């Protein structure tokens, strides 16, 4: 447990974690990208 | 070459259309790269 370098007044949102991926992640394989997940059939690129 | 579970493998034998006699291949390097690879190209001189 490390609540020292990862906690301070007013909060810290620096870290990140992925929930939307086109498929499963293969072991020991980094999938660094900033690509908006597709919902339905729209090619929307952005937030909303 | 191959990339099974990473561990990039390179083998090479030099014999001084295409020869028919069998040839072996000796590994020179074996290095654990462990990355995603999909396309191949060859450089020139
Ligand atoms: C490696 O590349 C293939 C082909 O683009 C992809 O399907 C696979 O998901 C990649 N590895 C990951 C991100 O686990």
From Swiss-Prot, chain A:
Outcome (variant: residue 20 to L): In strain: Omicron/EG.5.1
Region (Immunodominant HLA epitope recognized by the CD8+): 12-20
Source organism per UniProt: Severe acute respiratory syndrome coronavirus 2 (2019-nCoV)
Outcome, altering residue 17 to F: Decreased HLA binding to NF9 epitope. Increased binding affinity to human ACE2
Region span, Disordered: 19-48
Superkingdom, taxonomy of origin: Viruses
Free-text function comment from the UniProt entry: Attaches the virion to the cell membrane by interacting with host receptor, initiating the infection. The major receptor is host ACE2. When S2/S2' has been cleaved, binding to the receptor triggers direct fusion at the cell membrane. When S2/S2' has not been cleaved, binding to the receptor results in internalization of the virus by endocytosis using host TFRC and GRM2 and leading to fusion of the virion membrane with the host endosomal membrane. Alternatively, may use NRP1/NRP2 and integrin as entry receptors.
Chain segments carrying region Receptor-binding motif: 1-48
Impact upon substituting residue 8 to T: In strain: Omicron/BQ.1.1
Effect of residue 17 to F: In strain: B.1.1.298
Oligomer status and interactors: Binds to host ACE2. RBD also interacts with the N-linked glycan on 'Asn-90' of ACE2. Cleavage of S generates a polybasic C-terminal sequence on S1 that binds to host Neuropilin-1 (NRP1) and Neuropilin-2 (NRP2) receptors. Interacts with host integrin alpha-5/beta-1 (ITGA5:ITGB1) and with ACE2 in complex with integrin alpha-5/beta-1 (ITGA5:ITGB1). May interact via cytoplasmic c-terminus with M protein. May interact (via N-terminus) with host bilirubin and biliverdin, thereby preventing antibody binding to the SARS-CoV-2 spike NTD via an allosteric mechanism.
Listed name of the protein: Spike protein S1
First-to-last residue of the parent protein present: 437 to 485 of 1273
Lineage: Viruses, Riboviria, Orthornavirae, Pisuviricota, Pisoniviricetes
Gene name, Swiss-Prot/TrEMBL: S
């Amino acid at each position: 447990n490390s609540n020292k370098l990862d906690s301070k007044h007013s909060g810290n949102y620096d870290y990140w974690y992925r929930l939307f991926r086109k498929s499963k992640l293969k072991p020991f394989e980094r999938d660094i990208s900033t690509e908006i997940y597709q919902a339905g059939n729209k090619p929307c690129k952005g937030k909303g | 070459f191959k990339n099974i579970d990473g561990y990039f493998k390179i083998y090479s034998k030099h014999t001084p259309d295409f020869p028919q006699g069998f040839s072996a291949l000796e590994p020179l390097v074996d290095l654990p790269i462990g990355i995603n690879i999909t396309r191949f190209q060859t450089l020139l001189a």
